[PDB]
Amino acid sequence: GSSGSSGMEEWSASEACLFEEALEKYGKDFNDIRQDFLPWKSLTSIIEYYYMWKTTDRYVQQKRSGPSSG
């Protein structure tokens, strides 16, 4: 079992949750987190996700019709 920075970063459900809770608990301190929260994970590597998280709500739901009034 090995790993290598290639293609596109791929996190795990558990990992994702860990981060979120890491912010509410620790905050904008990637260090404090990467320290205990996620030792293996990298400092920046953890940050990258943050963006993908804040950029959420991107056409996640399907289109739907409305009242079409007007």
Side-chain angles (χ1 to χ4, degrees):
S2 198
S3 69
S5 207
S6 204
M8 286 72 91
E9 205 66 66
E10 295 202 37
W11 282 46
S12 271
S14 307
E15 271 270 339
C17 277
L18 270 150
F19 176 67
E20 289 176 74
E21 65 177 79
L23 210 63
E24 79 169 43
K25 197 204 180 297
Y26 270 135
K28 271 293 210 157
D29 270 82
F30 323 133
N31 210 261
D32 290 23
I33 306 156
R34 176 194 191 204
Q35 180 172 259
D36 274 63
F37 271 63
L38 314 156
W40 57 85
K41 278 282 162 165
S42 270
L43 205 289
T44 322
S45 291
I46 293 160
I47 301 162
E48 273 185 272
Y49 203 72
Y50 179 77
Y51 300 113
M52 193 284 296
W53 198 71
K54 90 90 150 56
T55 50
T56 43
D57 192 31
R58 280 277 299 192
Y59 210 135
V60 54
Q61 296 199 301
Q62 191 56 28
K63 178 161 180 79
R64 70 156 76 203
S65 63
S68 293
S69 187

